[PDB]
Amino acid sequence: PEEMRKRTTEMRLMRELMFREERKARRLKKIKSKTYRKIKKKELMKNRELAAVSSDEDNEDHDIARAKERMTLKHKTNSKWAKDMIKHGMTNDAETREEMEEMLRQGERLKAKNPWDLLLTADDSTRLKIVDFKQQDVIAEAFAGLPGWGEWA
Amino acid sequence: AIQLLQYLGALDNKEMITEDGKKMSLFPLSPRFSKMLLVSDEKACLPYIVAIVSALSVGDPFINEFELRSKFYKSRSQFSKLDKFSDVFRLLSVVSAMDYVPKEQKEIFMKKNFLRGKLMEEIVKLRKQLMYIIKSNTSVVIRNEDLKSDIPSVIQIKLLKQMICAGFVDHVAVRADVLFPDDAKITNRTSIINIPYIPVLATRTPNIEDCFVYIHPTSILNNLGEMPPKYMLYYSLHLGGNNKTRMNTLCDIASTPLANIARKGLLLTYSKPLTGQGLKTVNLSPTERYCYVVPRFGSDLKIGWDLNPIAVHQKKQKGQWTVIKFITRKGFQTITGEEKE
Amino acid sequence: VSSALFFQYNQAIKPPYQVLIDTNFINFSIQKKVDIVRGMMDCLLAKCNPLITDCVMAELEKLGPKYRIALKLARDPRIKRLSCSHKGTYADDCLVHRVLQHKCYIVATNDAGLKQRIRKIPGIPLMSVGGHAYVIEKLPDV
Amino acid sequence: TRSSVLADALNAINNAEKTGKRQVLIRPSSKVIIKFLQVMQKHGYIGEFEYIDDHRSGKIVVQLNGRLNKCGVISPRFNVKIGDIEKWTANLLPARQFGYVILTTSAGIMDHEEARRKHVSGKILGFVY
RNA sequence: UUUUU
RNA sequence: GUCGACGUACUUCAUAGGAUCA
Ligand SMILES: [Zn+2]
Numbered sequence: 037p038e039e040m041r042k043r044t045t046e047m048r049l050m051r052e053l054m055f056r057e058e059r060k061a062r063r064l065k066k067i068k069s070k071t072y073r074k075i076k077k078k079e080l081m082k083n084r085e086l087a088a089v090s091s092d093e094d095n096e097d098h099d100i101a102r103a104k105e106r107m108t109l110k111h112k113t114n115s116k117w118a119k120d121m122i123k124h125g126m127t128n129d130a131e132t133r134e135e136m137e138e139m140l141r142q143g144e145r146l147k148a149k150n151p152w153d154l155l156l157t158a159d160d161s162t163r164l165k166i167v168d169f170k171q172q173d174v175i176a177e178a179f180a181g182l183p184g185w186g187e188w189a
Numbered sequence: 190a191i192q193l194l195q196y197l198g199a200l201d202n203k204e205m206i207t208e209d210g211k212k213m214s215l216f217p218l219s220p221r222f223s224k225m226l227l228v229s230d231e232k233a234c235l236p237y238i239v240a241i242v243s244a245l246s247v248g249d250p251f252i253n254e255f256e257l258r259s260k261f262y263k264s265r266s267q268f269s270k271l272d273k274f275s276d277v278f279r280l281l282s283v284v285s286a287m288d289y290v291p292k293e294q295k296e297i298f299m300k301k302n303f304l305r306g307k308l309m310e311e312i313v314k315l316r317k318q319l320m321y322i323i324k325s326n327t328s329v330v331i332r333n334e335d336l337k338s339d340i341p342s343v344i345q346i347k348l349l350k351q352m353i354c355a356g357f358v359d360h361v362a363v364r365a366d367v368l369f370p371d372d373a374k375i376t377n378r379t380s381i382i383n384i385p386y387i388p389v390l391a392t393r394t395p396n397i398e399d400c401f402v403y404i405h406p407t408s409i410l411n412n413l414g415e416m417p418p419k420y421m422l423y424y425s426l427h428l429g430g431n432n433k434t435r436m437n438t439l440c441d442i443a444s445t446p447l448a449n450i451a452r453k454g455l456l457l458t459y460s461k462p463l464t465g466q467g468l469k470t471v472n473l474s475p476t477e478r479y480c481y482v483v484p485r486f487g488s489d490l491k492i493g494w495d496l497n498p499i500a501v502h503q504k505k506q507k508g509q510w511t512v513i514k515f516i517t518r519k520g521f522q523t524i525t526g527e528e529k530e
Numbered sequence: 531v532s533s534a535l536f537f538q539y540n541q542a543i544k545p546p547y548q549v550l551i552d553t554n555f556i557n558f559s560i561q562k563k564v565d566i567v568r569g570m571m572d573c574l575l576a577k578c579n580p581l582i583t584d585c586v587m588a589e590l591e592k593l594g595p596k597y598r599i600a601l602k603l604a605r606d607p608r609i610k611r612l613s614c615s616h617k618g619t620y621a622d623d624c625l626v627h628r629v630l631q632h633k634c635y636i637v638a639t640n641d642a643g644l645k646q647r648i649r650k651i652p653g654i655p656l657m658s659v660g661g662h663a664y665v666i667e668k669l670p671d672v
Numbered sequence: 673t674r675s676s677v678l679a680d681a682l683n684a685i686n687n688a689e690k691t692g693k694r695q696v697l698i699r700p701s702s703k704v705i706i707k708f709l710q711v712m713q714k715h716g717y718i719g720e721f722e723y724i725d726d727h728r729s730g731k732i733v734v735q736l737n738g739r740l741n742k743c744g745v746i747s748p749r750f751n752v753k754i755g756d757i758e759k760w761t762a763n764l765l766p767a768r769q770f771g772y773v774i775l776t777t778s779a780g781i782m783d784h785e786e787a788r789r790k791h792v793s794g795k796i797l798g799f800v801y
Numbered sequence: 802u803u804u805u806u
Numbered sequence: 807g808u809c810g811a812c813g814u815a816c817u818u819c820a821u822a823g824g825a826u827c828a
Contacts, residue, residue: 046475049475076465083483083498084465087481087497089467089468090467151289151340152286152289152340153347153445154344155445156348156352156449156450157231158227158355162228163228164227164229164230166215166323166327167327168215
């Protein structure tokens with residue numbers, strides 16, 4: 037049947053669609069600029085926070101997270117990278133100091149302990165079906181005052 | 190005026206009266222009030238909107254502080270119980286409460302609550318008349334206990350707010366710090382009455398401070414004690430004695446409901462699909478996709494702003510991506526898994 | 531003021547010593563391959579009766595499979611169990627409440643915040659693990 | 673190139689326990705591998721295992737039961753005296769009776785305590801705990 | 802200030 | 807010669823961050 041041709045078309049659309057994302061994903065992978073990634077991360081966080089995509093952490097989730105942090109102390113300057121930066125006057129620079137900071141605050145966050153949404157469907161189905169013209173329009177009158185796709189058109 | 194009727198859906202883009210427009214003309218009310226009735230029948234919310242609409246139609250029965258202290262606030266404390274961010278619901282509380290007052294004690298109640306006794310009478314009379322046209326044109330003898338109605342449910346409270354936004358879609362204002370944090374620096378010491386707001390479709394001036402709007406003294410939000418809501422509906426603007434534009438609050442609206450209400454209007458535009466972790470374009474078909482977008486509310490000479498991202502169902506109709514439906518976060522997450530399996 | 535304290539000297543804590551184990555202490559013992567019982571006997575040259583409370587134990591059970599080693603070491607029969615009579619499952623608050631109540635315990639921990647808050651309390655020997663073995667801070671008998 | 677079959681086998685077992693796999697395939701087999709697994713099995717860290725013959729070095733299939741915390745090989749196989757055995761136990765084991773240190777001594781492959789009981793010593797094969 | 806089906 | 811390169815020895819500049827309060 038000719039329905040087989042339709043199946044070929046939609047598969048073709050899928051494959052090329054994958055190709056476009058592949059090329060776009062490839063190009064982004066090559067760009068490894070610190071600032072470029074830094075801009076992208078901030079924007080992503082803003083959208084996720086704005087959309088509230090991330091579920092709230094119950095008291096249990098906080099307790100387990102705090103337990104692990106206290107258990108390891110992974111977010112203090114005794115870590116390798118922090119110690120190496122500190123001991124060699126590398127953190128005098130602002131940018132590395134921010135990164136060391138950004139680590140530290142994240143650890144601190146984990147350490148913290150008469151009687152007097154359902155979106156409305158305002159389509160016509162939910163309107164009160166109220167019930168009550170041309171001759172009145174005669175009175176207003178009484179006032180006075182795809183073609184050519186394949187052929188020549 | 191033609192724009193206003195267009196925003197409310199009365200007129201199409203050709204200035205031609207819509208089926209909604211013809212229905213509004215059957216009411217004696219302003220176009221704004223008629224539209225709220227066009228959305229009020231859902232979940233037996235009709236008496237509440239009638240009470241609100243009648244109260245707004247006849248004017249405020251409340252006596253203001255300037256026109257006149259302890260007995261003043263206890264009365265208001267009673268009628269602001271339904272919601273802490275809704276002046277309109279203060280009107281509803283009074284009107285509905287009046288229905289349960291015996292005829293003999295009514296005059297005592299109105300005086301005791303600093304209520305303009307007459308205006309209440311027209312509201313009840315107008316509440317009866319609107320009740321009559323509705324039942325007469327939907328199917329009529331109306332008796333006084335028909336006006337008696339019980340407290341709205343929390344769901345109904347949410348529906349009523351959006352319902353009102355339909356009649357006041359064009360009168361949404363956003364806190365200035367959200368749009369221009371540099372220009373609008375809010376501190377914890379800042380009085381609520383002095384928190385700037387910006388209305389939608391306000392003419393962009395060289396100085397954005399010129400577009401700032403501030404809350405009325407009469408509003409409960411001055412006594413709220415915490416930060417006001419992000420978005421606010423207003424009825425009218427008044428010029429304060431200090432040359433400060435002053436707004437009469439109606440009620441607050443959340444971001445996602447606002448987008449839904451503006452969707453059927455011309456206020457809402459959709460950005461391109463977002464990308465990143467969590468947010469990804471699930472492609473059902475060459476003509477179908479599910480994705481997150483950033484709705485923009487408002488109409489580069491007017492002040493519009495972007496709303497919270499929302500999951501939407503998009504279809505490629507005539508080569509353009511058209512939003513069919515909104516989707517909850519759970520539904521979108523389930524969709525993503527359904528594609529993976 | 532506790533009668534067991536002479537100015538800043540605690541004249542009650544004598545051998546054999548009673549020592550409270552903090553959760554983080556166990557790992558730093560494990561990271562350094564320091565046996566808990568012998569490690570303390572070595573630092574203090576005394577018999578030490580290790581004590582582990584419910585809250586710290588509850589913390590340990592919460593940790594998960596990754597810290598199973600600490601857990602079984604925690605359940606060693608030589609380790610005595612302390613009952614907790616307070617709702618909160620936090621460990622740091624529980625420990626300091628105990629040392630405040632009675633002045634006989636050594637606190638074994640490496641958490642800087644808890645160490646600082648113990649340091650404020652007088653007459654509380656503070657013990658830690660660093661380098662290669664345990665170290666005792668405020669204990670004159672050494 | 674492949675230097676130590678024992679290290680390969682132990683790493684495969686450890687990863688199989690990482691992923692929760694109840695059973696693991698080891699290639700190639702050897703006598704030392706079998707003896708090491710027999711010690712592990714006597715101490716109960718691993719369950720049954722199978723030797724599959726292919727007229728070559730062969731294969732092994734070990735059942736894994738979730739009581740193995742870690743297994744490793746000490747390469748090079750240092751010579752160990754009875755004086756130095758306690759040093760190795762202190763270095764390679766978290767505690768004094770957490771696991772065993774396996775030695776290939778002149779009387780065979782066995783854990784450290786058995787070597788002490790027999791009063792023997794030799795080269796060090798690895799550790800299990 | 803007014804004011805309307 | 808107030809010379810160049812290198813070696814050696816020293817000096818110096820880049821440290822504040824979050825919360826609350828006025
Ligand atoms: Zn406790």
